Amino acid sequence: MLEYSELYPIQNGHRMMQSLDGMWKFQFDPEEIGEKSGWENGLPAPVSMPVPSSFADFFTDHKERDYCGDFWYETEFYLPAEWRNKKIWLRFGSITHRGTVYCNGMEITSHEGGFLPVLADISTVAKPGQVNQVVVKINNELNETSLPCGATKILNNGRKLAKPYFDFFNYSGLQRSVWVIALPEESVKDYSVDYELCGTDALVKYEVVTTGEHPVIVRLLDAEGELVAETEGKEGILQVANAHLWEVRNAYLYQIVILITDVLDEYREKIGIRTVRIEGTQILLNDRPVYLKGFGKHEDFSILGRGFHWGIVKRDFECLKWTNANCFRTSHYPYAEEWYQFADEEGFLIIDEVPAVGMMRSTRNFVAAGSGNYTYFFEALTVPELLKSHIADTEEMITRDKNHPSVIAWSLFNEPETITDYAYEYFKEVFAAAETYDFQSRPMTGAFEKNSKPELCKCYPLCDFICLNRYYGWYISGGPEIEEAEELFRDEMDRWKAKELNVPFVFTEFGTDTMAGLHKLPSIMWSEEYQKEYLEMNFRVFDSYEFVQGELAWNFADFQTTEGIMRVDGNHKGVFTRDRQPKAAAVVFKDRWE
Amino acid sequence: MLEYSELYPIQNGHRMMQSLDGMWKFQFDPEEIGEKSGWENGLPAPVSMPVPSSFADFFTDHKERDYCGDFWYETEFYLPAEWRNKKIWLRFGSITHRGTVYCNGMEITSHEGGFLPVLADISTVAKPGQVNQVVVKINNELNETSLPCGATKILNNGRKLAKPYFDFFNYSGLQRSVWVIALPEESVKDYSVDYELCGTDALVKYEVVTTGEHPVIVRLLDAEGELVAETEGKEGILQVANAHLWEVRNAYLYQIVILITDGNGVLDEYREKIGIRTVRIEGTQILLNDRPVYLKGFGKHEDFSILGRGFHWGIVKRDFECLKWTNANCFRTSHYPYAEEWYQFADEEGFLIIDEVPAVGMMRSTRNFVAAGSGNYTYFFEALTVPELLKSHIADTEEMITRDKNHPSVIAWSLFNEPETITDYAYEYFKEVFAAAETYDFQSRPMTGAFEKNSKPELCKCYPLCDFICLNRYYGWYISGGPEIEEAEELFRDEMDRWKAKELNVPFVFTEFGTDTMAGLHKLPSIMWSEEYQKEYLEMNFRVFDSYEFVQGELAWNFADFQTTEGIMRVDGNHKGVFTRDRQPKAAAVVFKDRWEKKN
Ligand SMILES: [Cl-]
Ligand SMILES: [Cl-]
């Protein structure tokens, strides 16, 4: 279990917080001489770099956009003098992909994983009342011992080029907000809630972790601040009579309030009373079935790359609502915590995905996810280091996101090898670990490439429901062969039906690249009309199987990828353009999903 | 009465034809010296030029693209020896806009009007069994004394620049096929058919004009070649028992055969395909074969990448497959008569045509699309140029009607588009055009024209002349667009309520309505110029149309993106197309398909 708290920062009497967002100093370190040359003390010749954002798309030259290797940030903040006697942490929403944090010259901690928060305890070096310095050494290379997976090519000048095993640009930097926070010396470290429904009434079971021994009181407030339940102890049950349940696209948020007393700490968070259970082939939310309708997405916008902005969230949610979606998948990595906060208010359902993408050794991975070629990926001697990373990223993800009502499943892989017992052994461990970290035991899943065929795949028995990525009519029998493609699709769904697994299937990826404004009569692959015809055919197949309980189309919006001959300025399978405007097919979803 | 035949060329024993399409020789004449310098005998420094085609879009520099003034074409053809003792004509489908034809050095004839055939009798100068020469001086300037109307600016270096009073590019040259043909010394010059429906049977009234006095017999053949009627005489009635009528989008064509007989011999033989059908306006209704018809389709343009107005059959084939997928039954030949092939093919496919003379730009404005609702009168029909303009307007009408009157597809003549009509000088002008048109058409079929918003119900003086009234309105675009579209609808309905209150008891067709739409431009919520806005503008205008019993047709503007003269309001032509210039469909094309599948 973890040496820090994953809880979002708040500001009350006992807990303080100050934003470090703004313009930082930035400098590339291509010869990797920073540590030995005093950069922990300040950067020798930096530039200005916005935070949060991704560094790549600001520059005007290739070597800098495509930089791969070591690079540094530095900034300076004044701590209020009133934060003596408090524990003081730096909280980075993310450090992509790995980094060591230095503060006032001292190395505080290093982290691996570029999509989950990083906590640095600077209590012993922070100078309250004075100006303080923070310096972060970051690395954005890809390998097969960390997620997401890939490789690093050295070119003739010795400069490094990222060669990912995934299909999305390797944005990196400090992409999410950065805080400095003050906690009490005895503090709430973690807590977990589970829900039971008793007719109209409800139980909120909870457990609490603290950095101390003092008694804990837990209060639960309704939307208007009035009290509805109170229990003493670090373990308890809250009784909410005539409970107001969090519903799909109709949220109700209670407020939990955790206290440590003699009052030493207070933590407050919005939660939603709802239950998630798989009965047979159905997904039950509050004991009634739900059908998932929505999109795979990316944290991706012009200029900012993966940088968080609230304006992107607002628009992306006003578009999801306009299509009448109810659900999205945080593909292929946990998002910024603000996305889940807002999903909670709006009643969207989230499949939360750990970044286990790239577990097949292929640099053009999307044509290759149906080629039939096994890459011997889980037979290699780096696999134990990889497994340790994957489990640690699952643990940090679940701890961070488990108390959001919108999060209803965990996706623990996208398009890996599953056709050999080497991969069963691997994934069995991962699921085992995820089952222990989630106090609610909500459904665990992953998304399968076409190569994980019903006859050969070893891993679908680990899944509570099964997610399929399928491109019938695009990478398989596309264009004039599109009727062959429908058959082949039905052929496979027939074989899955024949297995009588009695579990739900969700299509988590299907789509066509579509250039906005390419019209052709008759339609051709890449036009707007072909996208509509494609979707109308996948819909017919989905609607032919009682156990298909969900469609998450790929993608919500055009996004940026590694450049290559099959990628025309990124990936054009969006239903919206990258500036968040709808292609002709968005209307297809809107109508179907009403 | 015209000094030549408008009859399309055929090839039998009595009548022979030869195409002159190919690379011709071409030369600009900016100093206007060709005649004094002997260009009538050949050009001194030519380049090659495709025929048929408009010259403008081939070149890579502005001076040649935008050329305005005199320019010359030349080619050479071999006349077979066997054409001695025939009358030999050159037949240009069109010479744009005016020209003078020369054959082996000799001025044969001159013609004014850029969109109808030019016939030049070269019988005295032709040399059969030898190689012959044709040379044409063309001028593409615009003025206020011919159609279509514009003006001509002289730049500071002496260059002429066309400044049209219309919104389409001033393509010009030899835009249509060219033939040399041989006719008999006694030939059929002209004929005309009218029809009456007799239950299962039908009458084909007719009349023939020849160049001599030998007698005529007229035969009528069904679709399979079999004889169904015969009559002696230059005027007659053919009696067709168990007639197959020509019906909208369900065409049947008879062959008519006109012979000039020397007892047991044949002197001339002309064959055209025709279609029995009747057209009549009864009250507010447009009756085809005695049932009501709702017009659904488009205003078009003879326009295409590289070719300009140049004629190609593939442009036809694609454009008709698109109209059929759309479920249209109609189109208007805005704003000039088309190549004859367009009509021939509309006959096979059963489309209805409104045939438009080129009477456009009768109002002095160079940005004339912002000005058809401005409210500003330009005294256009009180100028002393007007009597000359009237004469060539009538002349183009007579030539259009004489040419096109025997196509079943042609159900009405449009004699103006967006002129000034709020004035008695304009009533007196158009009373003459309409009176002329009535006489040249043997079927006395409906005559109309299209009115700008400026020609309000209270002010207009010209709508009485029309058998039905065509309106060009842009409520939701030029008027009260974008955020104000709610208001554009109430304004529209207020105008229609005033037309209603006049109780004119005539049908109204909407011949223009549309929005510039950039393919690929998507906005949510929609904005003027987005594809989404096109669809909404349309849904709005349909609600208005459907609120009025007397609205009996809707021709959207335009079938396809097309080229205009350039300027700040024109992003590479006009983008009111429902299809792109390369004839693929924007999102509002299915709006039409669905509405029109489920009308009548
Ligand atoms: Cl460069
Ligand atoms: Cl130039």
Coordinates of C-alpha atoms in Angstrom, one line a residue, chain B residues 58-517:
Chain B
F58 CA -6.8 27.0 -70.0
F59 CA -4.3 29.8 -69.5
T60 CA -1.9 30.4 -66.6
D61 CA -1.8 34.2 -66.5
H62 CA -4.5 36.8 -65.7
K63 CA -4.4 38.8 -68.9
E64 CA -5.5 35.9 -71.0
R65 CA -8.1 34.5 -68.5
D66 CA -9.7 37.9 -68.1
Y67 CA -9.4 38.8 -71.8
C68 CA -12.2 41.1 -73.1
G69 CA -12.6 42.2 -76.7
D70 CA -11.9 40.8 -80.2
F71 CA -10.5 37.3 -80.7
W72 CA -10.3 35.0 -83.6
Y73 CA -10.7 31.3 -84.4
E74 CA -9.5 29.3 -87.5
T75 CA -9.6 25.8 -88.9
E76 CA -9.5 23.9 -92.1
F77 CA -11.8 21.0 -93.2
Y78 CA -12.0 18.8 -96.3
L79 CA -15.3 18.8 -98.1
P80 CA -16.1 15.5 -99.8
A81 CA -16.4 15.8 -103.6
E82 CA -19.9 14.2 -103.4
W83 CA -21.4 17.4 -101.9
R84 CA -21.5 19.3 -105.1
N85 CA -25.1 20.3 -105.9
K86 CA -26.0 20.6 -102.2
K87 CA -26.6 23.7 -100.1
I88 CA -23.7 23.8 -97.6
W89 CA -23.9 25.4 -94.2
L90 CA -21.6 26.0 -91.3
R91 CA -23.6 25.4 -88.0
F92 CA -22.1 26.6 -84.8
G93 CA -24.1 25.6 -81.7
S94 CA -23.1 29.0 -80.3
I95 CA -20.7 31.9 -80.9
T96 CA -20.2 33.8 -77.6
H97 CA -21.2 36.6 -77.6
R98 CA -21.2 38.0 -81.2
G99 CA -19.2 37.1 -84.3
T100 CA -18.6 37.3 -87.9
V101 CA -18.0 34.2 -90.0
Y102 CA -15.6 34.0 -92.9
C103 CA -15.1 31.1 -95.3
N104 CA -12.2 31.0 -97.8
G105 CA -11.7 34.8 -97.3
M106 CA -15.3 35.8 -97.7
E107 CA -17.5 37.4 -95.1
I108 CA -20.5 35.0 -94.9
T109 CA -22.5 36.3 -92.0
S110 CA -22.7 38.0 -88.6
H111 CA -24.6 37.0 -85.5
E112 CA -25.4 38.6 -82.1
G113 CA -26.3 36.4 -79.2
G114 CA -24.0 34.0 -77.5
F115 CA -26.2 31.1 -76.7
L116 CA -28.1 30.0 -79.8
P117 CA -27.0 28.5 -83.2
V118 CA -25.3 30.4 -86.0
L119 CA -26.0 29.4 -89.5
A120 CA -23.7 30.5 -92.3
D121 CA -24.5 29.7 -96.0
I122 CA -21.2 28.9 -97.7
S123 CA -22.7 27.3 -100.9
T124 CA -21.3 29.9 -103.3
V125 CA -17.7 29.9 -101.7
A126 CA -17.4 26.3 -100.7
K127 CA -15.0 24.1 -102.6
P128 CA -15.9 20.4 -102.6
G129 CA -13.2 17.8 -103.1
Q130 CA -10.8 20.5 -101.7
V131 CA -9.6 21.7 -98.3
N132 CA -11.5 24.7 -97.0
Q133 CA -10.9 27.4 -94.4
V134 CA -13.2 28.9 -91.7
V135 CA -12.3 31.9 -89.7
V136 CA -14.4 33.6 -87.1
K137 CA -14.0 37.0 -85.4
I138 CA -15.6 36.9 -81.9
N139 CA -16.2 39.7 -79.4
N140 CA -17.1 39.0 -75.8
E141 CA -17.8 42.5 -74.5
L142 CA -21.0 43.3 -72.6
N143 CA -23.2 46.3 -73.2
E144 CA -26.8 47.5 -72.5
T145 CA -28.1 46.7 -76.0
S146 CA -27.8 42.9 -76.1
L147 CA -28.2 39.9 -73.8
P148 CA -26.9 39.3 -71.3
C149 CA -26.3 42.9 -70.1
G150 CA -23.2 44.5 -68.6
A151 CA -20.6 47.1 -69.1
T152 CA -17.0 47.3 -70.2
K153 CA -14.2 49.0 -68.1
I154 CA -11.1 50.3 -69.8
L155 CA -8.1 49.9 -67.5
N156 CA -5.2 52.4 -67.3
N157 CA -3.0 50.4 -69.8
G158 CA -5.9 50.2 -72.4
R159 CA -7.0 46.7 -71.5
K160 CA -10.7 45.9 -71.6
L161 CA -12.3 44.3 -68.6
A162 CA -15.8 42.8 -68.5
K163 CA -18.1 44.1 -65.8
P164 CA -21.2 42.0 -66.0
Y165 CA -24.5 43.0 -64.5
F166 CA -25.0 39.3 -63.7
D167 CA -23.5 36.8 -61.2
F168 CA -21.7 34.3 -63.4
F169 CA -18.3 34.3 -65.1
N170 CA -18.1 35.7 -68.6
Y171 CA -16.9 32.6 -70.3
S172 CA -16.9 32.9 -74.1
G173 CA -15.7 31.6 -77.5
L174 CA -16.8 28.5 -79.4
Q175 CA -18.4 26.7 -76.5
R176 CA -20.5 24.2 -78.5
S177 CA -19.9 21.7 -81.3
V178 CA -19.5 22.9 -84.8
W179 CA -20.6 21.2 -88.0
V180 CA -20.4 21.7 -91.7
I181 CA -23.5 20.2 -93.3
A182 CA -25.0 19.6 -96.7
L183 CA -28.7 20.0 -97.4
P184 CA -30.9 19.4 -100.4
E185 CA -31.7 22.3 -102.7
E186 CA -35.3 22.0 -101.5
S187 CA -35.3 21.3 -97.8
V188 CA -37.4 21.2 -94.7
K189 CA -36.6 24.5 -92.9
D190 CA -39.0 24.2 -90.0
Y191 CA -41.9 22.4 -88.5
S192 CA -44.1 22.6 -85.4
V193 CA -46.4 20.2 -83.5
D194 CA -49.3 20.8 -81.1
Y195 CA -51.3 18.0 -79.3
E196 CA -54.8 17.3 -78.2
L197 CA -55.8 14.3 -76.0
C198 CA -58.7 12.2 -77.2
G199 CA -59.1 9.6 -74.5
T200 CA -57.2 6.5 -75.6
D201 CA -56.3 8.4 -78.7
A202 CA -54.4 11.6 -79.5
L203 CA -54.1 14.2 -82.2
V204 CA -50.8 15.6 -83.5
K205 CA -51.5 18.9 -85.2
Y206 CA -48.5 20.1 -87.3
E207 CA -47.2 22.4 -89.9
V208 CA -44.1 22.3 -92.1
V209 CA -42.1 25.0 -93.8
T210 CA -40.0 24.1 -96.9
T211 CA -37.9 26.1 -99.4
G212 CA -39.7 25.0 -102.5
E213 CA -43.1 23.8 -103.6
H214 CA -43.0 20.1 -104.0
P215 CA -45.5 18.3 -101.7
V216 CA -45.0 17.1 -98.2
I217 CA -46.0 13.9 -96.5
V218 CA -45.6 13.4 -92.7
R219 CA -45.2 10.0 -91.2
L220 CA -45.3 9.1 -87.4
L221 CA -43.5 6.1 -86.1
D222 CA -43.9 4.5 -82.7
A223 CA -40.9 3.7 -80.5
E224 CA -40.4 0.3 -82.2
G225 CA -40.3 1.8 -85.7
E226 CA -43.9 0.9 -86.8
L227 CA -46.1 3.3 -88.8
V228 CA -49.0 4.7 -86.8
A229 CA -50.1 7.8 -88.8
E230 CA -49.6 9.5 -92.1
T231 CA -50.9 12.7 -93.7
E232 CA -50.2 14.6 -96.9
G233 CA -49.9 18.4 -96.7
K234 CA -47.8 21.1 -95.1
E235 CA -50.5 21.5 -92.5
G236 CA -52.2 18.5 -91.0
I237 CA -53.5 16.4 -88.2
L238 CA -51.9 13.0 -87.5
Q239 CA -54.4 10.6 -85.8
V240 CA -52.7 8.3 -83.3
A241 CA -54.8 5.4 -82.1
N242 CA -53.9 4.1 -78.7
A243 CA -51.3 6.7 -78.1
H244 CA -48.5 6.3 -75.6
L245 CA -48.3 9.7 -73.9
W246 CA -45.0 11.3 -72.7
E247 CA -45.3 11.5 -68.9
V248 CA -43.1 13.0 -66.2
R249 CA -40.1 10.8 -65.6
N250 CA -41.9 8.1 -67.7
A251 CA -41.1 9.2 -71.3
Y252 CA -42.4 7.8 -74.6
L253 CA -41.1 9.2 -77.9
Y254 CA -42.4 8.9 -81.3
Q255 CA -40.3 9.6 -84.4
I256 CA -41.8 12.1 -86.8
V257 CA -40.7 11.9 -90.4
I258 CA -41.1 14.7 -92.8
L259 CA -40.6 14.0 -96.5
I260 CA -40.5 16.2 -99.6
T261 CA -41.7 14.1 -102.5
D262 CA -41.0 14.2 -106.2
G263 CA -43.9 11.8 -107.0
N264 CA -42.3 8.4 -106.5
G265 CA -39.1 9.9 -105.1
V266 CA -37.8 11.7 -102.0
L267 CA -36.1 15.1 -102.1
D268 CA -35.6 15.7 -98.4
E269 CA -36.2 13.6 -95.2
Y270 CA -36.1 15.0 -91.7
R271 CA -36.6 12.9 -88.6
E272 CA -36.9 14.1 -85.0
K273 CA -38.2 12.3 -81.9
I274 CA -41.2 13.9 -80.2
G275 CA -43.5 13.1 -77.3
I276 CA -47.2 13.5 -77.1
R277 CA -48.2 15.5 -74.0
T278 CA -50.3 18.6 -73.1
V279 CA -49.5 21.5 -70.8
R280 CA -52.1 23.9 -69.4
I281 CA -52.5 26.2 -66.5
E282 CA -56.0 25.9 -65.0
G283 CA -56.4 28.2 -62.1
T284 CA -53.5 27.8 -59.7
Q285 CA -52.6 24.4 -61.1
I286 CA -50.0 23.2 -63.7
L287 CA -51.6 20.4 -65.7
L288 CA -49.6 17.9 -67.7
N289 CA -51.8 15.4 -69.5
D290 CA -54.7 16.8 -67.5
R291 CA -53.3 16.1 -64.1
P292 CA -51.6 18.5 -61.7
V293 CA -47.8 18.5 -61.4
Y294 CA -45.6 19.9 -58.6
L295 CA -42.3 21.1 -60.0
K296 CA -39.3 19.8 -58.0
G297 CA -35.7 20.5 -59.0
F298 CA -33.1 23.0 -59.7
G299 CA -31.7 26.0 -61.6
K300 CA -28.6 24.8 -63.3
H301 CA -25.6 26.3 -65.2
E302 CA -23.6 25.1 -68.1
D303 CA -20.4 25.0 -66.0
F304 CA -17.6 22.6 -65.3
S305 CA -14.0 22.5 -64.2
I306 CA -11.6 23.6 -67.1
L307 CA -14.3 23.4 -69.8
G308 CA -16.4 26.4 -68.7
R309 CA -19.6 26.3 -70.6
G310 CA -18.1 23.9 -73.0
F311 CA -20.5 21.0 -73.8
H312 CA -19.7 17.5 -72.9
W313 CA -22.1 14.5 -72.9
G314 CA -20.5 13.2 -69.7
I315 CA -21.4 16.4 -67.8
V316 CA -25.0 15.6 -69.0
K317 CA -24.9 11.9 -68.0
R318 CA -23.6 12.7 -64.5
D319 CA -25.9 15.7 -64.0
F320 CA -28.9 13.6 -64.9
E321 CA -28.0 10.6 -62.7
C322 CA -27.7 13.2 -59.8
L323 CA -31.1 14.7 -60.6
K324 CA -32.7 11.2 -60.6
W325 CA -31.1 10.2 -57.3
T326 CA -32.5 13.5 -55.9
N327 CA -36.0 12.6 -57.1
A328 CA -36.4 15.8 -59.1
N329 CA -38.6 16.1 -62.1
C330 CA -37.6 19.6 -63.3
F331 CA -34.9 22.1 -64.0
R332 CA -34.7 25.6 -65.4
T333 CA -32.1 26.6 -68.0
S334 CA -30.9 29.5 -66.0
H335 CA -29.9 31.9 -67.4
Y336 CA -29.6 31.1 -71.1
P337 CA -30.6 28.4 -73.6
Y338 CA -28.5 25.3 -73.2
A339 CA -26.7 23.2 -75.7
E340 CA -29.4 21.3 -77.6
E341 CA -28.2 17.9 -76.4
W342 CA -29.4 18.8 -72.9
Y343 CA -33.0 18.9 -74.2
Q344 CA -32.7 15.8 -76.3
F345 CA -31.7 13.9 -73.2
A346 CA -34.3 15.5 -71.0
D347 CA -36.8 14.1 -73.6
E348 CA -35.5 10.5 -73.1
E349 CA -35.5 10.9 -69.3
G350 CA -38.8 12.6 -68.9
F351 CA -37.7 15.8 -67.2
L352 CA -39.6 19.1 -67.3
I353 CA -37.7 22.1 -68.5
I354 CA -38.3 25.8 -68.2
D355 CA -36.4 27.4 -71.1
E356 CA -34.9 30.7 -70.3
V357 CA -33.8 33.4 -72.8
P358 CA -30.7 35.2 -71.6
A359 CA -32.5 38.3 -70.4
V360 CA -30.6 38.8 -67.2
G361 CA -28.9 41.9 -65.7
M362 CA -31.6 44.4 -66.7
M363 CA -30.7 46.6 -63.8
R364 CA -27.4 48.5 -63.6
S365 CA -25.4 47.0 -60.7
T366 CA -22.0 45.2 -60.7
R367 CA -22.7 43.4 -57.3
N368 CA -26.3 42.6 -58.4
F369 CA -27.1 39.8 -55.8
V370 CA -27.0 42.1 -52.8
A371 CA -29.1 44.5 -54.9
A372 CA -32.1 42.3 -56.0
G373 CA -33.6 43.2 -52.5
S374 CA -31.8 46.6 -51.9
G375 CA -34.8 48.7 -53.0
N376 CA -32.9 51.0 -55.4
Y377 CA -34.3 51.7 -58.9
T378 CA -31.7 52.4 -61.7
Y379 CA -34.1 53.9 -64.4
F380 CA -33.0 51.0 -66.6
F381 CA -35.9 51.0 -69.1
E382 CA -36.0 54.7 -69.8
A383 CA -32.6 54.9 -71.4
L384 CA -32.3 55.5 -75.1
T385 CA -30.4 52.2 -75.6
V386 CA -33.7 50.4 -74.7
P387 CA -35.2 50.1 -78.2
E388 CA -32.1 48.3 -79.4
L389 CA -32.2 46.0 -76.4
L390 CA -35.8 45.2 -77.0
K391 CA -35.1 44.2 -80.7
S392 CA -32.3 41.8 -79.7
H393 CA -34.4 40.4 -76.8
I394 CA -37.2 39.6 -79.2
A395 CA -34.7 38.2 -81.7
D396 CA -33.2 35.8 -79.0
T397 CA -36.7 34.8 -78.0
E398 CA -37.8 33.9 -81.6
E399 CA -34.6 32.0 -82.0
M400 CA -34.9 30.1 -78.7
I401 CA -38.6 29.2 -79.3
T402 CA -38.0 28.2 -82.9
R403 CA -35.2 26.0 -81.8
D404 CA -36.6 24.4 -78.7
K405 CA -40.4 24.4 -79.2
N406 CA -40.7 20.7 -80.3
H407 CA -39.1 19.1 -77.2
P408 CA -41.7 17.5 -75.0
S409 CA -39.6 18.4 -72.1
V410 CA -40.1 22.1 -72.6
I411 CA -43.2 23.2 -70.7
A412 CA -42.7 26.9 -70.3
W413 CA -40.7 29.9 -71.5
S414 CA -39.0 32.2 -69.0
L415 CA -38.5 35.6 -70.6
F416 CA -36.6 37.5 -67.9
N417 CA -34.7 36.9 -64.6
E418 CA -34.7 39.7 -62.0
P419 CA -35.3 42.8 -64.1
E420 CA -36.8 46.2 -62.9
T421 CA -40.6 45.9 -63.2
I422 CA -41.9 48.6 -60.8
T423 CA -42.3 51.0 -63.7
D424 CA -44.6 51.6 -66.7
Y425 CA -41.5 51.8 -68.9
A426 CA -41.0 48.2 -67.9
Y427 CA -44.6 47.1 -68.5
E428 CA -44.4 48.7 -72.0
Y429 CA -41.1 46.8 -72.6
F430 CA -42.3 43.4 -71.6
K431 CA -45.8 43.6 -73.2
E432 CA -43.9 43.5 -76.5
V433 CA -41.6 40.6 -75.6
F434 CA -44.6 38.4 -74.4
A435 CA -46.6 39.4 -77.5
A436 CA -43.7 38.3 -79.6
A437 CA -43.3 35.1 -77.8
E438 CA -47.0 34.2 -78.1
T439 CA -46.7 34.3 -81.9
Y440 CA -43.6 32.1 -82.4
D441 CA -44.9 29.2 -80.4
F442 CA -47.4 26.9 -82.1
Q443 CA -48.4 25.3 -78.7
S444 CA -49.3 28.6 -76.9
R445 CA -47.6 27.2 -73.8
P446 CA -47.1 29.1 -70.5
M447 CA -44.9 32.1 -70.3
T448 CA -43.3 33.5 -67.2
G449 CA -40.2 35.0 -65.7
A450 CA -38.5 35.2 -62.4
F451 CA -38.9 38.2 -60.0
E452 CA -36.4 39.7 -57.6
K453 CA -37.6 40.7 -54.1
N454 CA -37.5 44.4 -55.3
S455 CA -40.5 43.7 -57.5
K456 CA -43.0 43.9 -54.6
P457 CA -46.7 43.0 -54.9
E458 CA -47.8 46.7 -54.4
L459 CA -45.2 48.1 -56.9
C460 CA -44.9 45.5 -59.6
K461 CA -46.5 46.1 -63.0
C462 CA -45.3 43.0 -64.9
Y463 CA -46.8 40.0 -63.1
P464 CA -50.1 40.4 -65.0
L465 CA -48.3 39.3 -68.2
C466 CA -47.3 35.9 -66.8
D467 CA -49.3 32.7 -67.0
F468 CA -47.5 31.7 -63.8
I469 CA -45.2 33.7 -61.5
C470 CA -41.7 32.6 -60.6
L471 CA -40.1 34.1 -57.5
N472 CA -36.5 34.3 -56.4
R473 CA -36.3 34.8 -52.7
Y474 CA -33.5 34.5 -50.2
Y475 CA -35.2 34.9 -46.8
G476 CA -32.7 33.5 -44.4
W477 CA -29.7 34.5 -46.4
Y478 CA -29.4 37.9 -48.1
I479 CA -32.4 39.0 -45.9
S480 CA -32.4 38.4 -42.1
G481 CA -29.9 35.5 -41.9
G482 CA -28.1 33.5 -39.3
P483 CA -29.3 34.6 -35.8
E484 CA -32.3 36.5 -37.3
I485 CA -33.7 33.5 -39.3
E486 CA -36.8 33.5 -37.1
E487 CA -37.5 36.9 -38.5
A488 CA -36.7 35.9 -42.0
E489 CA -39.5 33.4 -41.8
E490 CA -42.1 36.0 -40.6
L491 CA -41.0 38.4 -43.3
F492 CA -41.4 35.7 -45.9
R493 CA -44.8 34.7 -44.7
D494 CA -45.8 38.4 -44.7
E495 CA -44.9 38.7 -48.3
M496 CA -46.7 35.5 -49.2
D497 CA -49.8 36.7 -47.3
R498 CA -49.9 39.8 -49.6
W499 CA -49.6 37.7 -52.8
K500 CA -52.5 35.6 -51.4
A501 CA -54.7 38.6 -50.7
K502 CA -54.4 39.7 -54.4
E503 CA -56.3 36.5 -55.1
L504 CA -54.6 36.3 -58.6
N505 CA -55.6 32.7 -59.0
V506 CA -52.3 31.7 -60.7
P507 CA -49.7 29.2 -59.8
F508 CA -46.4 30.4 -58.1
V509 CA -43.1 28.6 -58.6
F510 CA -40.1 29.3 -56.5
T511 CA -37.2 29.4 -59.0
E512 CA -34.4 30.5 -56.7
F513 CA -33.6 30.0 -53.0
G514 CA -30.4 28.8 -51.5
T515 CA -27.4 29.5 -49.2
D516 CA -23.7 29.6 -50.0
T517 CA -22.4 26.4 -48.4

